[PDB]
């Protein structure tokens, strides 16, 4: 029997979702592209990229820092070019992010007021930028990646621009803080350059200011859908700049809007936590050009900041998020009738907590602050505060526990810990190379030597640089489109044997003394967890589809692998959450522990098993003895303290009052 130390004293709180953006334009006729991804903006400055294939797995995370946020996200997908992401931090800068490294490729100043809204034209060669001073700035991007140029300033006005939308590339539609919708001409070779063709005023609340939070253009019906602080949804005739229909649907501000590919449905959401579906699907409605308030649904416990829509032959996704810090996913065609998923608030694809078997130390790092606890019942031995604004990416603790390595993309710092008076004394060991070194992943060979994978994927050994050779990866159209798939995702060091997994699935065995690379595996699904077992002389690899693969180190894949890879128990297959962490069992080496965000599993690798909707159907390619428990959830981190002790770490705002009638 085994000992469980259930821990909730470690608290990690996700930042509120602020923006959402898909990387491709919906095409119902065509199949879902392999490169489709979802970008998620967070109030802490973090940007998260997710893949809608194989349920939903998070391919890469861009780390934010102190006193920074994301308020608008925008994709540009030019044929033959890498996928391009842009973000606005609430200040007078448009940030271009290097997806390969996750660092800011370019920072461009709008030469205007603070940015409130960002939008791209259909040709994807121009960005429209909304400013608080009422200026809308047009920026060129067609020059190339990393190229941001000032094109034109539209007609100036005195109201803050809260949102922006495009009609092809001719006109810019903007909602303003004065309760007026404004249209400008971006037609080139036109005398009406930058002029305000029409002005539309919404119904204005008598006792409070009226704000147009969201506006969207509807190509099929050449209409504008606008959301306003009064809770009104208004449909406007584009050519005549006149109100067609008005609906008092929401009880609070409508913060965001979205529509389907055919413009048969408009989905509104915002403060009142409800999603209202507006339908024009019926033929008679289409002839009459009249919308219908089809239905509404309450799915979020707090404000819905962002909603986005994607559709294809194999995809039908309505994704929403907000202050609740969780994703809610729906089917546009069956929003009223379809089932929904509430995404877990934290899925530890990247672990923010580590457990040290020796000294019984638990270490958690969050927002440049590192806390270490000791447990015999738990005491906070020491708390470390780091000056630099950039959040900590990874922290690694030595097998003696004396040496703690803190890694950030900007810098890597090493701190020695000495136990004095049931407390840890912190002394920063000075290593110039580490300070100037970017650290995507760091691991300990022993109490002294470490392996660091740079943001450029340069693997080297530092004794406390001995670079390690790495096999070249053939370029692919998917790799060009999404750069980071070819980047190293997981780095594990186990008794001198180092295994690196890339997002494209490339698994290679690296010998650290020899510093030579030998190819092991190249999986066609994203790799979610890796483990090396010296006793069985095998490496365990888990893909996004939750299939388990155990590779002998040189006939590669252990005989258990065949008999059990496709013969996994029903629990493993039924999981819609992918495995993220693997750790061995001290008592028996063959047994291995596997856990996800909400589940923990143990599998004996010496025993063969008895043979006996809201995700992409996956018709297209990704590129181009048994114990199962779900009692413990959500799980930040799980590992063993001793041979008979298991450590489980778990997680422990004012919202709208929508009364639940009870009789």
């Amino acid at each position: 029997r085994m000992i469980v130390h259930r821990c909730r004293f470690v608290d990690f709180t996700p930042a509120t979702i602020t923006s959402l953006a898909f990387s491709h334009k919906s095409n119902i006729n065509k199949l879902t592209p392999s490169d489709l991804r979802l970008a998620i903006g967070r109030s802490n400055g973090n940007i998260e990229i997710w893949n809608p294939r194989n349920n939903w797995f998070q391919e890469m995370v861009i780390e934010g820092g102190k006193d920074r946020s994301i308020e608008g996200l925008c994709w540009s997908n030019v044929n033959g070019e890498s996928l391009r992401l842009f973000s606005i931090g609430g200040s007078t800068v448009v940030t271009e992010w290097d997806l390969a490294t996750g660092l800011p490729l370019r920072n461009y100043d709008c030469n205007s007021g603070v940015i409130w809204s960002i939008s791209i034209n259909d040709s994807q060669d121009k960005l429209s930028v909304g400013c608080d001073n009422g200026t809308v700035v047009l920026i060129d991007i067609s020059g190339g990646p990393g190229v941001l140029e000032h094109d034109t300033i539209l007609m100036r006005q005195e109201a803050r621009v809260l949102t922006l939308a495009w009609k092809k590339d001719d006109f810019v539609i903007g909602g303003c803080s004065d309760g007026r919708i404004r249209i400008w001409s971006a037609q080139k070779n036109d005398e009406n350059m930058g002029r305000l063709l029409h002005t539309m005023k919404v119904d204005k609340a008598k006792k409070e200011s009226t704000l147009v939070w969201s506006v969207i253009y509807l190509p099929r019906t050449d209409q504008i859908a606008s959301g306003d602080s009064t809770g009104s949804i208004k449909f406007w005739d584009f050519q005549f700049a006149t109100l067609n229909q008005s609906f008092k649907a929401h009880d609070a501000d409508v913060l965001c809007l979205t529509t389907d590919t055919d413009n048969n449905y408009v989905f509104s959401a915002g403060v009142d936590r409800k999603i209202f579906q507006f339908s024009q699907n019926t033929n008679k409605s289409q002839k009459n050009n009249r919308w219908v308030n089809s239905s509404n649904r309450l799915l979020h416990g707090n404000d819905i900041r962002a909603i986005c829509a994607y559709q294809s032959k194999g995809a039908d996704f309505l994704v929403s998020g907000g202050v609740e810090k969780t994703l809610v996913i729906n089917s546009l065609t069956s929003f009223s009738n379809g089932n929904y998923r509430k995404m877990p608030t934290v899925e530890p694809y990247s672990k923010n907590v580590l457990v040290n078997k020796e000294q019984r130390l638990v270490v958690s790092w969050s927002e440049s602050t590192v806390k270490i606890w000791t447990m015999g019942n738990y005491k906070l031995v020491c708390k470390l505060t780091l000056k630099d604004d950039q959040n900590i990416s990874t922290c690694s603790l030595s097998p003696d526990g004396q040496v703690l390595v803190v890694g950030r993309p900007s810098t890597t710092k090493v701190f020695h810990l000495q136990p004095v008076g049931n407390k840890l004394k912190v002394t920063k060991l000075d290593n110039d190379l580490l300070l100037r070194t970017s650290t995507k992943l760091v691991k300990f060979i022993d109490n002294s030597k470490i392996v660091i994978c740079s943001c450029e994927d340069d693997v080297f050994i530092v004794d406390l640089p001995q670079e390690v050779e790495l096999l070249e990866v053939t370029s692919t159209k998917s790799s060009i489109k999404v750069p980071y798939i070819n980047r190293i995702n997981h780095l594990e060091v186990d008794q001198n044997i180092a295994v690196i997994s890339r997002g494209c699935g490339v698994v290679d065995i690296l010998d650290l003394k020899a510093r030579i690379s030998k190819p092991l595996a190249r999986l066609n699904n994203f790799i979610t967890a890796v483990h090396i077992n010296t006793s069985r002389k095998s490496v365990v690899v888990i893909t996004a589809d939750n299939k388990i693969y155990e590779f002998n180190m040189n006939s590669v894949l252990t005989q258990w692998s065949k008999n059990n890879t496709d013969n996994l128990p029903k629990e493993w297959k039924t999981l819609k959450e992918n495995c993220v962490g693997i750790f061995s069992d001290i008592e028996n080496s063959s047994r291995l522990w596997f856990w996800g965000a909400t589940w923990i599993s143990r599998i004996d690798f010496d025993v063969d098993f008895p043979i006996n909707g809201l995700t992409i159907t996956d018709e297209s390619n990704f590129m181009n003895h048994f114990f199962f428990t779900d009692k413990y959830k959500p799980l930040l981190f799980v590992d063993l303290i001793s041979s008979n002790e298991l450590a489980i770490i778990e997680r422990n705002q004012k919202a709208f009052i929508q009364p639940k009638l009870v009789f």
Partner: peptide, 14 residues
């Protein structure tokens, strides 16, 4: 927490 808190800026200063 102040007993076990460590501040880098104060440590850097002295």
């Amino acid at each position: 927490e102040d007993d076990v808190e460590y501040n880098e800026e104060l440590d850097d200063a002295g």
